[PDB]
Amino acid sequence: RFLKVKNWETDVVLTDTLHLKSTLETGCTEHICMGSIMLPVRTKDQLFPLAKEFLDQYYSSIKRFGSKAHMDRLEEVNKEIESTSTYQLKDTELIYGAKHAWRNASRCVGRIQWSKLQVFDARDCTTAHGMFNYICNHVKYATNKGNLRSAITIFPQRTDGKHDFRVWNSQLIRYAGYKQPDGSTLGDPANVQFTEICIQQGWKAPRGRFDVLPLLLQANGNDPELFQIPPELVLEVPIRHPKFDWFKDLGLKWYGLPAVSNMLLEIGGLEFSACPFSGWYMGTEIGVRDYCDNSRYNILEEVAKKMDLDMRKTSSLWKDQALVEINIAVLYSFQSDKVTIVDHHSATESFIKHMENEYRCRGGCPADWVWIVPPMSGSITPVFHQEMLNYRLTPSFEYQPDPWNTHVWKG
């Protein structure tokens, strides 16, 4: 069975066969679409078919399918599973898996870069201190003095689920958020809950509007531990505007390295619960969401005042106006400091090229329109008019519960 998608701006039609290789479920049915829902201890019983399926993919990709090396590896994995109840990926397989988990990330507009991912194997790590070291080196290598490089660090896989490695931070670098007694919030409202945990765990908060949070790291199921990233490793960018001299006086800055650390990487049935990965920012992530979301820094008001906009009627589109200027200032600041950033126009254009290339050489590209389309100026970006098919392929990155909700506290 073949399925088609149409770009309605260019009339270009692409044929997806890859969707057939999909096993996992979307959340949708014949009678309901869950396309806009945010989110719609594994035994030896169900593990080898997962293992086999992955190794089949792996050896296909290296043109060794059916080879003696392929079959021997199947047998080796088999025996190791029935013997140890799990199994270990070779380095080659780990690297392939991590790249393809990104390649398959249907909500990610940056996937044109998927094959140049730098994979750091931290599966030998045993302690939080050890984790801190791996993460410091990740941050230093990824940052590259502003010339950002994609990277992922992979900590040991889940065993019995009682010995997980977790990074408790949702990102390696994020700013603290403080709920004040008068109801207002200091810093980043998105991080108030995590910030409180840190403080309870003994973190001494500067209580400023842009405090970098400590790393809260969990090794082998033990209680998590606090570490401070060396400030010289955290590259930041003062936010100013090319035309508005008063914008600097808003006192804003953002960090340069987006590094998501609370997701789970799944490869051939193995579960990697701590796998922080990083690339670089699309401007709108900071300038639209991180600044202008009502539940975030929410500086729309302030910028609109300084621009002397008509904030009386919404139909003055003062919000729209301020949003653009803020995103202008974010791109300007990063480029000025030679820190890698991509605008939403460049990025969506790239993606369409990536998508078309993926449909031809792979037979498809799973894509989530709800997430791919930028949070401003959607229809003047080429993904808006692009029909997309969304399905779930493995290896994949998955959501997982916040560790503080499931963790058994040692003490």
Ligand X SMILES: C[C@H](O)[C@H](O)[C@H]1CNc2nc(N)[nH]c(=O)c2N1
CB atoms near residue 39 (< 10 Å): 7
| Start-end of H helices in 312-343 | 318-336
Catalytic one of 102, 103, 108, 166:
108
Active-site residue 280, yes or no? yes
Nearer to ligand 8FD, 281 or 359 (CB): 281
**d(C-alpha 392, C-alpha 365), whole Å:** 10
Residue 139 makes contact with ligand HEM by CB under 6 A: no
| Start-end of H helices in 181-298 | 192-200, 283-284, 291-292
**d(C-alpha 198, C-alpha 342), whole Å:** 32
> Applying CB under 6 A, which of residues 210, 227, 244, 384 lies at the interface with ligand X?
384
Q: Which of residues 23-42 bind Zn ion (CB under 5 A)?
A: 28, 33, 35
262 contacts which partner out of ligand 8FD, Zn ion, a copy of itself, none, CB within 5 to 8 A by kind? Answer: ligand 8FD
Residue 384 makes contact with a copy of itself by CB under 8 A: yes
Which residues contact residue 32 at a Cβ distance below 8 angstroms, ignoring those fewer than 6 apart?
A: none
**d(C-alpha 349, C-alpha 65), whole Å:** 35
Residue 194 makes contact with ligand HEM by CB under 6 A: no
R_g of the chain, CA atoms, integer Å: 23
Per the omega criterion (within 30 degrees of 0), is the bond before 214 cis?
A: no
371 contacts which partner out of a copy of itself, ligand X, Zn ion, none, CB within 5 to 8 A by kind? Answer: ligand X
The response to whether 171 counts as a known ligand-binding position is yes
Distance of closest approach, residue 402 Cβ to ligand HEM, in angstroms:
14
Residue 399 makes contact with ligand 8FD by CB under 6 A: yes
Nearer to a copy of itself, 217 or 237 (CB): 237
Nearer to a copy of itself, 22 or 170 (CB): 22
> Applying CB under 6 A, which of residues 227, 371, 384, 404 lies at the interface with ligand HEM?
371
**d(C-alpha 151, C-alpha 277), whole Å:** 6
Distance of closest approach, residue 67 Cβ to ligand 8FD, in angstroms:
34
Q: Which of residues 31-50 bind ligand X (CB under 6 A)?
A: 36, 38
Distance of closest approach, residue 170 Cβ to ligand 8FD, in angstroms:
6
Active-site residue 108, yes or no? yes
Do 149 and 141 touch, CB atoms closer than 8 A?
yes
Burial class (CB in 10 A: 0-12, 13-18, 19+), 314: exposed
47 contacts which partner out of a copy of itself, ligand X, ligand HEM, none, CB within 5 to 8 A by kind? Answer: none
Binding mask 256-295 for ligand 8FD (x = CB under 6 A): --x-x-xx-------------xxxxxx--x---x------
**Left if phi > 0, otherwise alpha if psi is -120 to 50, otherwise beta: which for 239?**
beta
Q: Which of residues 249-278 bind ligand X (CB under 6 A)?
A: none
**d(C-alpha 351, C-alpha 342), whole Å:** 12
Catalytic one of 93, 225, 266, 285:
285
> Applying CB under 8 A, which of residues 46, 180, 315, 405 lies at the interface with a copy of itself?
315
Q: Which of residues 318-377 bind ligand X (CB under 6 A)?
A: 370-371
Residue 152 makes contact with ligand HEM by CB under 6 A: yes
The response to whether 134 counts as a known ligand-binding position is no
Which residues contact residue 368 at a Cβ distance below 8 angstroms, ignoring those fewer than 6 apart?
A: 35, 106, 107, 388, 390
261 contacts which partner out of a copy of itself, Zn ion, ligand HEM, none, CB within 5 to 8 A by kind? Answer: none
**d(C-alpha 340, C-alpha 136), whole Å:** 19
Phi/psi for 226 (5° steps) reads -90, 135
**d(C-alpha 255, C-alpha 123), whole Å:** 28
Q: Which residues bind ligand HEM (CB under 6 A)?
A: 102, 105, 107-110, 113, 117, 150, 152, 277, 279-280, 282, 285, 342, 347, 371, 397
| Binding site residue list | 36, 108, 171, 280-281, 285, 370-371, 384, 399
